[PDB]
Amino acid sequence: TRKYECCAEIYPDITYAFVIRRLPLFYTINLIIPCLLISCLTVLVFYLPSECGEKITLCISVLLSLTVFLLLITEIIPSTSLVIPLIGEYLLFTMIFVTLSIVITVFVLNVHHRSPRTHTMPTWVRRVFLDIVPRLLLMKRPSVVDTDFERSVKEDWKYVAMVIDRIFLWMFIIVCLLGTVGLFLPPWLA
């Protein structure tokens, strides 16, 4: 029962609350699983060698697929600003980190194709990325003595690019695992 400013009397009403649970199989199969399959490929770019000439293809494809699926989700949910779907947040964060991976990939490809005729390797770069980081990353370079200076520096640039890829392969895997668990695990616990 309640009073309305229209009228001086009390007007009763009966309000029915329909608590309805969605059966998630259809949208599971059609949205969630494809999104997870695409998410499985987000870090693969950092294990592709720079000589394959296909890093850009892979990372761009992942970015565009994630964007398309975000757009598909947007057409289903209401355009309300009070709550954000967890699927939407996950897709947006994955898109952000895939964009970051594309930027890093461009940088790594640029580093790979450097030669003495165009670039000079600083001593600090040589020290760090040929002695320290490879040791911390458990990768051991063979001890090879190339006599040709131009062909040896080109191989050092190619190895520096591999190390930078491996660093970000580790960080993105940690972020991918921590982010996914840090987003979906707590809700599933109550």
């Binding site: 294990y47 394959c52 190619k158």
Partner: protein, 61 residues
């Protein structure tokens, strides 16, 4: 639908194949300047597996 289930199964397999192809490409572009081949890799992948798969590395050298 069974067609949908089959398509989903094939999509999972193709994702598996993408991961495996990335790994294969990583292996293919390896050289002595950057990687050293462990003797177990040598044995397994150059003698045992090829014999099982009927490949017979020519090994002329």
């Amino acid at each position: 639908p069974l067609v949908g289930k089959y398509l989903m199964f094939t999509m999972v397999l193709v994702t598996f194949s993408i991961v495996t192809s990335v790994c294969v490409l990583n292996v293919h572009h390896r050289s002595p300047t950057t990687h050293t081949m462990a003797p177990w890799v040598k044995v397994v992948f150059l003698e045992k597996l090829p014999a099982l798969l009927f490949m017979q590395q020519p090994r002329h050298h």
